[PDB]
Structure 1
């Protein structure tokens, strides 16, 4: 359930994130920062909402949503999206739509770590976080 994700998480390892950022339209200079930054992600429940707060030396973001309910999201890379997060089995699936495009992030708990799999088209990146 959602409670399994409710913790403070710190990024430890990213796989193929440069190509993923490039596919999304992030420029070279910003990709260099994105490839070294290791954010902290705080996930919590507040009433009927789930809150995901990302803290980093690049940008800080926060989204608050109800599962299954579409919301407006302005992403850290400055895309204005329509987003929907659902709990599919034991995984949180976040679908972001903008400018006729779509990307998705799947968050799962695997062996006690949070694993985030990001897909845009045929480009897949994987980000691994440890509980702090």
Structure 2
């Protein structure tokens, strides 16, 4: 009933081609993660395209850039293995929390999370590691 209407309407809102339009404190966020000088210099100029789609029962997230191209495929709320763009081998869970799509990565006893939300048609991504928070805005292409 309302459960399937919530899950279908939420996933539908996020499924699009998203272009990065704005970044805030992403450099600090990469520094808190332990991303070195070399990669950070690339990461601060790289303009990603994020494609979110439904491929069967799975939700797919493709991050396309001149640095590295990543692709993750998952069932909502079911843990999966993920090798990140900065070569961290995580145990990750992508889930729904109200109007938010929450991505939690765990590796080496550490934890980082990315919260994606739709705000006035834009996708706002909040990246958190400890006290360090970054905000990235995306628009539909």
TM superposition shift of 1:74: 0.2
RMSD of equivalent CA atoms? 0.5
- Residues of 1 paired with 2:124 and 2:113: CA distance? 13
TM superposition shift of 1:48: 1.1
- Residues of 2 paired with 1:32 and 1:114: CA distance? 24
Which secondary structure state, in structure 1, belongs to the residue aligned with residue 92 of structure 2? strand
- Residues of 2 paired with 1:47 and 1:30: CA distance? 34
- Residues of 1 paired with 2:120 and 2:41: CA distance? 30
Which residue does 2:74 correspond to in 1?
Answer: 65
Point out the structure with the larger helix share.
2
Deviations 1:110-132 (Å, cap 9, x if unpaired)? 01000000000000000000100
Deviations 1:92-119 (Å, cap 9, x if unpaired)? 0000000000000000000100000000
Which residue does 1:81 correspond to in 2?
Answer: 90
- Residues of 1 paired with 2:66 and 2:17: CA distance? 16
TM superposition shift of 1:90: 1.3
Matched ranges for 1:1-132 at <5 A = 1-132=10-141
- Residues of 2 paired with 1:59 and 1:3: CA distance? 26
**Which runs of at least 4 in structure 1 moved beyond 3 Å after TM superposition?**
none
Which secondary structure state, in structure 1, belongs to the residue aligned with residue 39 of structure 2? helix
TM superposition shift of 1:29: 1.5
Aligned residues: 132
Name which one, 1 or 2, has greater alpha-carbon Rg: 2
TM superposition shift of 1:56: 0.1
TM superposition shift of 1:47: 1.4
Q: TM-score, normalised by structure 1?
A: 0.99
- Residues of 1 paired with 2:36 and 2:129: CA distance? 16
TM superposition shift of 1:46: 1.3
